[PDB]
């Protein structure tokens, strides 16, 4: 029937003045654009069919052609920025927004999907979708007493498109649009479907990836406890965005970090810092590095939760990027911590792995490690235990690494190693 049409035949049908022939040709185009391998998007565009599809979007009297054209345009918009732009230049944005209020659920869903692709192109098309007025009808679709009454796929597509409206930076989404969307996002974050939860967490992670004012907009909604709960989830597609959001939040002020701590986040990090997924371990260690950059009482809560041994473990064995995040966490700890906290760090066995990491080629991790060593030596000075620390570093083989770095190409490493050797060895 409408399977395996040539683009020539699609054009001939769409150019007929017979609405049923146009419908059949548009369905043939939809099937062609829905094929697994190499959908001929560019051929359809070059055939000049986008304006016809856009006009069909407005055929309220023929819902089937509305649906078929919406699907075809969705799939065109799913491609490169040039193809998405071709869809936008045809006038598709206001037509899809008008379809959001269709009485046919599959047509409304298809319009949601298409607007999601368009907004997902980037900040410019995101903001253009917003300016055409998409947020109000989108959120109206979710204004029901119980989200569970909605079809699962419909709700997932709505959540995904909203997440794209929260996505991208330079610029970040308009503040008023974020304020308009956030309440529905909180509600979705309490939903039970794993994909809705994952995409809601992704949206929150986008919204917290910015200055402290954006983070504050999010944390004011009271979502941090739910984020920590989701951080404890079994589904990795949920844990990943939840952890990203928590890390973003702890890049903010000490009070926002404290909201994360008060919600119980630290209790999850024994598992996260040993998680078999390398990305989770790296992100959790980065989050820890930003928590140890906080107040001394926050460092103390890190200590009380027993997380220093886990940082020693990650420093001792992990993917190198995770080890660099751990080196950062240790340097922040030693920069902000009390003398007692630093000596505790030493008692947990930090020196040996910290020195073993000095064999790395990355210059920045070497600088970080040397800064940490200097801070630890300063605490030792305050206690008159500099000699014990020097003996420890010499026994683990770190003095050799430092005296070798004395001949390092970078100036900072050179000077820091020379200072350490001349001052304590």
């Amino acid at each position: 029937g409408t399977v395996n049409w040539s683009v020539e035949d699609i054009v001939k049908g769409i150019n007929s003045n017979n609405l049923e022939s146009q419908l059949q040709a548009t369905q043939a185009a939809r099937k062609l654009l829905s094929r697994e391998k190499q959908p001929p998007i560019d051929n359809i565009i070059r055939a000049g069919l986008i304006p016809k599809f856009v006009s069909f979007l407005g055929k309220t009297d023929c819902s089937p052609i509305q649906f078929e054209s919406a699907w075809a345009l969705t799939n065109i918009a799913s491609g490169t920025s040039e193809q998405t732009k071709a869809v936008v230049d045809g006038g598709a944005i206001p037509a899809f927004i008008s379809l959001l209020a269709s009485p046919h659920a599959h047509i409304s869903e298809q319009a949601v999907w298409a607007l999601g692709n368009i907004a997902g192109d980037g900040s410019a098309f995101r903001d253009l979708v917003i300016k055409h007025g998409a947020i109000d009808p989108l959120l109206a679709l979710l204004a029901v007493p119980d989200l569970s009454t909605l079809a699962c796929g419909y709700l997932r597509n709505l959540t995904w498109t909203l997440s794209n409206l929260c996505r991208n930076k330079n610029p970040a989404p308009p503040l008023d649009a974020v304020e308009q969307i956030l309440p529905t996002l909180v509600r979705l974050l309490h939903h039970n479907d794993p994909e809705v939860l994952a995409d809601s967490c992704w949206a929150i992670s986008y919204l917290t990836d910015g200055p402290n004012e954006r983070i504050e907009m999010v944390v004011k909604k009271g979502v941090v406890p739910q984020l920590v709960k989701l951080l404890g989830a079994t589904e990795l597609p949920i844990v990943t965005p939840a952890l990203r959001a928590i890390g973003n939040i702890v890049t903010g002020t000490d009070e926002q970090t404290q909201k994360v701590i008060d919600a119980g986040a630290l209790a999850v990090f024994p598992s996260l810092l040993t998680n078999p997924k390398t990305n989770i371990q790296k992100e959790a260690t980065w989050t820890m590095s930003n928590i140890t950059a906080g107040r001394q009482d926050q460092i103390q809560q890190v200590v009380n939760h027993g997380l220093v041994p886990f940082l020693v473990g990650v420093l001792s064995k992990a993917d190198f990027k995770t080890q660099k995040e751990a080196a950062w966490a240790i340097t922040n700890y030693t920069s902000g911590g009390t003398v007692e906290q630093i000596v505790y760090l030493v008692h947990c066995g930090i020196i040996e792995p910290l020195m073993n990491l000095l064999s790395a080629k990355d210059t920045k991790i070497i600088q970080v490690i040397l800064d940490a060593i200097s801070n630890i030596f300063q605490a030792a000075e305050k206690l008159g235990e500099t000699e014990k620390l020097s003996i420890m570093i010499e026994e683990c083989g770190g003095l050799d690494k430092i005296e070798a770095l004395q001949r390092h190409e970078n100036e900072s490493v050179y000077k820091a190693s020379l200072n350490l050797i001349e001052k304590y060895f």
């Binding site: 973003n248 903010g252 950059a293 922040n332 920069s335």
Partner: peptide, 5 residues
């Protein structure tokens, strides 16, 4: 000890 994004 400053935050890193």
């Amino acid at each position: 000890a400053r935050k890193r994004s």
